[PDB]
Structures are given as C-alpha cells and as structure tokens.
Amino acid sequence: MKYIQTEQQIEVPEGVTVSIKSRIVKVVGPRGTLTKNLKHIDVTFTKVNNQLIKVAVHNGGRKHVAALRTVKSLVDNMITGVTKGYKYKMRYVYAHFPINVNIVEKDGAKFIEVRNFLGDKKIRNVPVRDGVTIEFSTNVKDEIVLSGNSVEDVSQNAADLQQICRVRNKDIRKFLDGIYVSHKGFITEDL
C-alpha cells in the first residue's frame, strides 16, 4: 500500500568504522576490511552516532520494504565479518572410498584437490577464493575448514566443494558420499 517510511538499525562496535558515499559501503575493522555495492537498491543510510547507522525506505511497496531488512542484514555481516570473522567447517563422508583432499597450486592459484571420490580415478579441483583460507583440521577425522572475512565468500567456496561431490547415477539415499557443511560459526572464540 506504500508505507511512508520504514527503517532499520545497523549497529556499530568499538572496532569498526563504516563509510558510505552513494551506496558504496566500506566496513573496516580489526580483521581487515571489505566493501559492498548496494547501488541496486534505493535506501537512505543516515549516520546517527559512530555506533549507529539507520537505513530507510520512503513510500515503498512491499517488495521494496522487504529489501530493507536484507540490506541491513547484508551490511551487518560485513560488520561482523571484520570483527569476529567466519569459519565454515565441513566433513568428508564416504562409506567405503576414502575421500582424499589436498591443497594444490598452479600459477599462484591455490585449489582444493579432491581425489578418489567413490574411487573415481578422476581428480576434482575447486579453486580457493581470495579472502578464504583453508585449513585441514588436526585432531578431527576427515574435517576441512574454510576461514575468512566474508560470509558470502566462505559460504560460496564451501558450497563449491560440496557440490563438486554430487553423486550421479546411483540412489543418493544409499550412496551418501560427499563433503558437507557441518558447522557454520565465527573465527574469534567465545563469540
């Protein structure tokens, strides 16, 4: 019905400063920094106090308002990603064939190299994104760990691997082999 103004609150910590000309957002904190291009949207960001920034929609329709929250959300995980950080954990899952996973490197690169999936003689490679840093977890069996500053990047590099291990031509109920996201959390502990 066109709501004349609804707004949101992006709350800011002690570590970060976040600065927005046109709709180019830059969040910089302890973990480094990241930036996002909200120009596809039409909201109005308004600094109120170093720890608070409202964003708003004037005379907006349902779909528009509905983009308000997700702008807030989007910027909020920019803010978190640069303080706490993101740590997506994953588990190799195989019922006979030991899925063997390694980092390789051709011309800078860094890829995640998956071998022997269901005994496939083929070699799988997922590239490692810029921003994300992969650790092969110690003290955990067949666990892999994608760390880094950006949910979007971590969660995508995560999903790349897990989808490069889709099983074909068998019943995927019985054949549950793969690499799966088993835990999504933060980098800095306690929080």
Binding site: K2, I4, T44, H58, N59
Partner: protein, 172 residues
C-alpha cells in the same frame, strides 16, 4: 461519472383524490449534473417503494455544499458493488477535504482496484469519522501520526524543449 456534485433530492408519489399529501422521501445523491441526479433518485426509489417516475414527482432538488471545504476530514465510506461473478458489500476509508472529492476518488478506486464501472456501484453511506483511532484502515491511519513529515525522492522536472544542454538532476 464526472466531477461530482451532491444533491438533496425530494420526491413523492403523485397525489390522488383520496391520498392528497403523499409521504415525501429524500435522498442525497452524488451526481454530476442535476439531470443525472433525478434519474438516480428515481432509480433508487424504484428499488425501494412502489413508484415510478411516471406516477410521482420531484418536489425539490438542492445542491448541498461542503460544510467546511478546507478542513481535512477522515471519511468512512460504504459501498455495495457488483463484480463479474456476484455482488458484494464493502467498507473503505478516504482522507480528503469534502464528501464530494471523497466520492470522486472512491469511484476511481473501484474502477482501478476492482474494475467496477459507475453503474455497478451503490453508495450506502459516506460519513465523517469523528474520533481518530476509530479509523480502521492502515493506509489512512498512516497519515495521522504526530509531527508527520516526508521527503519526495527522485524528483522529475518536466522539460519544455526537446533538447537540454545539462544532464538532469533529480535532487530535491
């Protein structure tokens, strides 16, 4: 049906030998000229009493003017309306300045939101919502908050020469 007037119309059954002074009924009618207004009166009367224009007379026809033409009033409005597959009663609220502008936009709404041509609509009640917060529709109550203000983003001036030497600027 145009830009509306509102008419007090008064009619009555034709007087008879043994019933002189028939009863006298009035309707307020929103219509554009008074020629339509009388048509309407008779239209609604025949859907009410045993009369025809043939057997009756208009007694008075009087434009009613808005009591307080530049007072913002909140209107509750009561329509009965015909759709493609049946008929329906409705209640809408309209925040304008006169019953007459209020009925104008109604008729527009019904056209736009419900494809309801003029013929298909009966106005049952147009009434001034006296105390706020008996205002029942959100799209109106939105406009009743204290100290209300708002911007008009992405403003668009209308050029008067095909060509322009600057590049437009929707600031405001």
């Amino acid at each position: 049906m145009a830009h509306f007037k509102e008419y007090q119309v008064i009619g009555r059954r034709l007087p008879t030998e043994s019933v002189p002074e028939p009863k006298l009924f009035r309707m307020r009618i929103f219509a554009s000229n008074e020629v339509i207004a009388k048509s309407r009166y008779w239209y609604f009367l025949q859907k009410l009493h045993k009369v025809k224009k043939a057997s009756g007379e208009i007694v008075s026809i009087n434009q009613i003017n808005e009591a307080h033409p530049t007072k913002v009033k909140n209107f509750g409005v009561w329509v009965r309306y015909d759709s493609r597959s049946g008929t329906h009663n409705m209640y809408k609220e309209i925040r304008d300045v006169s019953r007459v502008a209020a009925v104008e936009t109604l008729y527009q709404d019904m056209a736009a939101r419900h494809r309801a041509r003029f013929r298909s609509i009966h106005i049952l009640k147009v009434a001034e919502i006296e105390k706020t917060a008996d205002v029942k529709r959100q799209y109106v109550k939105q406009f009743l908050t204290k100290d209300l203000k708002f911007p008009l983003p992405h403003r668009v001036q209308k050029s008067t020469k095909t060509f322009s030497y600057k590049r437009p600027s929707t600031f405001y």
